[PDB]
Amino acid sequence: TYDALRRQLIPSFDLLYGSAVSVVAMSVPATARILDLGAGTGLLGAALRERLPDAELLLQDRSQAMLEQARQRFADDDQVAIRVADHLDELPAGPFDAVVSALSIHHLEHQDKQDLFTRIRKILRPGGIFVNVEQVLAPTSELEKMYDRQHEAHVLASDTPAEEWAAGRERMKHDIPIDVETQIQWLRDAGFTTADCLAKDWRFATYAGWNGS
Ligand SMILES: Nc1ncnc2c1ncn2[C@@H]1O[C@H](CSCC[C@H](N)C(=O)O)[C@@H](O)[C@H]1O
Ligand SMILES: [Ca+2]
């Protein structure tokens, strides 16, 4: 039900989450240590586990209530740990082969995003990857209205319950998105040697930075 509702709310869920899993699987070994930042109920971690059965996953979030759903999702998994931490709290020591995030970093002020990308690179192995499945802003107000129409079109086409879309619109008041190319440049500023947008559906995009590749 929860997972079904995320697909109803998020355009191109399989393309965007799938692209995150694929780019990690082509960038790190089977036995990678992976941090999922703002893991929530652990959906991105779960997508990674399906492809990488031997990866060690650390799921981190500020919300014990969200992480309880992740604990249930990963009940029988001996290679998953859970950590309660804000993005602005001290990160785990690492090192990590990959740091991944979905629909979380857009909650931070822009300066805190720029600092976070830098802090993430410091806990990555050389050649390590940062991947974000993210809600992004259009480059202009007029395009932002078109992004909004395309998002609403997916939500309506998916037969999303009206109450859940209303609750979605209210949660989105707290969002601090920026355009995808600005955030990709922030990865270059943080010292990532390569950064790219792998996949995009208007308001939603999967992008990555490599720490030396
Ligand atoms: N500053 C912050 N530090 C840590 N987690 C944060 C945060 N701001 C928001 N979050 C978390 O970010 C998540 C956004 S919802 C996305 C959850 C999950 N990554 C998924 O793809 O389904 C929530 O679990 C919320 O608690
Ligand atoms: Ca949000």
| Elucidated via | X-ray
How deeply is 129 buried, as exposed, middle or buried, from its count of CB atoms within 10 A (0-12, 13-18, 19+)?
Answer: buried
How deeply is 13 buried, as exposed, middle or buried, from its count of CB atoms within 10 A (0-12, 13-18, 19+)?
Answer: buried
User: Is 62 a pocket residue for ligand 1 (Cβ < 6 Å)?
Assistant: yes
Cα(66) to ligand 2 centroid in Å equals: 14
Query: In 3D, which of 212, 179, 175, 208 has the Cα closest to residue 99?
Result: 208
Cβ atoms of 8 and 159 closer than 8 Å: yes
Task: For strands 33-37 and 96-102, give the pairing.
Answer: parallel
How deeply is 34 buried, as exposed, middle or buried, from its count of CB atoms within 10 A (0-12, 13-18, 19+)?
Answer: buried
Q: After which residues is the chain broken (C to N over 2.5 A)?
A: none
Query: In 3D, which of 52, 104, 50, 102 has the Cα closest to residue 73?
Result: 50
Query: In 3D, which of 131, 133, 180 has the Cα closest to residue 27?
Result: 131
Residue 131: nearest ligand to its CA? 1
Cα(54) to ligand 2 centroid in Å equals: 31
SS3 35: strand
Cα(168) to ligand 2 centroid in Å equals: 9
In the CATH scheme, what is the homologous superfamily, with its name and number, of domain 2-210? Vaccinia Virus protein VP39 (3.40.50.150)
* Closest atom of ligand 1 to CA, residue 108: 1
Distances (CA, A) of 57 to 11, 94, 133, 155: 26, 12, 17, 31
Residue 5: nearest ligand to its CA? 1
How deeply is 174 buried, as exposed, middle or buried, from its count of CB atoms within 10 A (0-12, 13-18, 19+)?
Answer: exposed
Give me the phi and psi of 106, to 5 degrees please: -65, -5
Check the annotation: does 151 bind a ligand: no
Resolution of the determined structure in angstroms stands at 1.5
Element (H, E) at 182: helix 180-189
What is the amino acid identity at position 71? R
Place of tokens 């202009």: 140
The region that residue 202 occupies, defined by phi over 0 for left and psi between -120 and 50 for alpha, beta otherwise, is: left
User: Is 134 a pocket residue for ligand 1 (Cβ < 6 Å)?
Assistant: no
